[PDB]
Amino acid sequence: HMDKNELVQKAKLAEQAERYDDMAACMKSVTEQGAELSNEERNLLSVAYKNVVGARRSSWRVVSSIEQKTKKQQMAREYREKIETELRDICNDVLSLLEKFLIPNASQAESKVFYLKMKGDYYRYLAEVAAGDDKKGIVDQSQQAYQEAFEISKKEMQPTHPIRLGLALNFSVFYYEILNSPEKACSLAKTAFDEAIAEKDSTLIMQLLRDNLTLWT
């Protein structure tokens, strides 16, 4: 094995150097040493891959725009599908890290919810560009990962745990953007906001929840 301490150091370096593919490779090795991940490690992995998948989602949205606003149109379609192939590879890379190492090893409830939330996020990103037969299946995976994470989050976490709040946010976005259910999305968002009302980190996520509810109505 390599030195996981070194790997975490390189990945902080890569982050500062805005080299997120590097950051992801470092943290994926860390993960491939089979140990549970500390909290610092957990977040550096998530941040790395958020950025890696993020650059591709951006590029995809932008090239789709160009394609739908144009021979030229057909080369924009090939390019979009190349960005898509890249994006699918990143998404399945992450997802099999979650299924193979992270989820099985997660000792606490907090981590299990974090990782299954991630699982929901990356099946969502697959859904955003998915074919249509192998798309309902992908949506289902995202839904069930979010679902699992939701139940656990109810049991072992206050309505104010920023991880359960962020989970409610992304799950609601899943209902809006993927399932096309502004109703289910708006009820879920609000039920989480109102339940977090009673019991400053969580406030940020709560404000985001509100802003989304306002925009959706």
Binding site: S46, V47, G54, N170, Y176, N212
Partner: peptide, 8 residues
């Protein structure tokens, strides 16, 4: 802006 959580 971003609908989903900020984690980048």
């Amino acid at each position: 802006r971003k609908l989903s959580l900020q984690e980048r």
